[PDB]
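Researcher: Let's walk through a ligand-bound prediction step by step. First, I give you the protein sequence. Second, the SMILES string for 3PE. Third, you return the three-dimensional complex as structure tokens. Ready?
Model: Ready.
Researcher: Here are steps one and two:
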Amino acid sequence: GWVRPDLGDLSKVTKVKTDRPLPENPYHSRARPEPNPEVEGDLKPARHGSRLFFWTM
Amino acid sequence: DGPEKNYERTMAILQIEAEKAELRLKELEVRRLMRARGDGPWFHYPTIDKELIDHSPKATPDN
Ligand SMILES: CCCCCCCCCCCCCCCCCC(=O)OC[C@H](COP(=O)(O)OCCN)OC(=O)CCCCCCCCCCCCCCCCC
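Model: Step three, the predicted complex:
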């Protein structure tokens, strides 16, 4: 009772049920370094302007 | 101008120049720390963007 698969059958992506648990860290990754502390707040005008030498603005 | 106006105008001028002077010193020390530790918005030299990586299953399994 063996039926030959059709053209395109064997290239199908299929789903398979397994009782094996999905690996947790397949790449064996170390812990990622923490991100740089985010800078947040309300953008206020620069205090006393540029403050370049004598400039007052 | 009376002495009182010039006197208190001077205090206003000194406050601004003192505050600016403190900020100038603080910026030099912040710049020193940011450059040495790379943990601030300044001296943040780019690394490769990770959204460029393709995580799709490959032609072979071990990768
Ligand atoms: C350039 C004039 C001096 C000529 C001699 C050359 C001197 C050496 C030049 C090297 C640079 C030194 C300049 C020193 C002043 C710069 C620092 C400064 O002035 O503070 C910032 C200034 C705002 O000045 P502020 O104290 O806030 O006073 C406001 C008054 N309304 O904001 C600024 O920085 C801009 C001010 C630059 C000074 C010239 C502009 C003054 C506005 C007049 C422009 C002309 C308008 C009339 C147009 C006539 C058209 C025919």
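Researcher: And what stands out?
Model: Chain A touches chain B through six residues (CB under 8 Å). The pocket of 3PE is lined by residues A 54-57 (CB under 6 Å).
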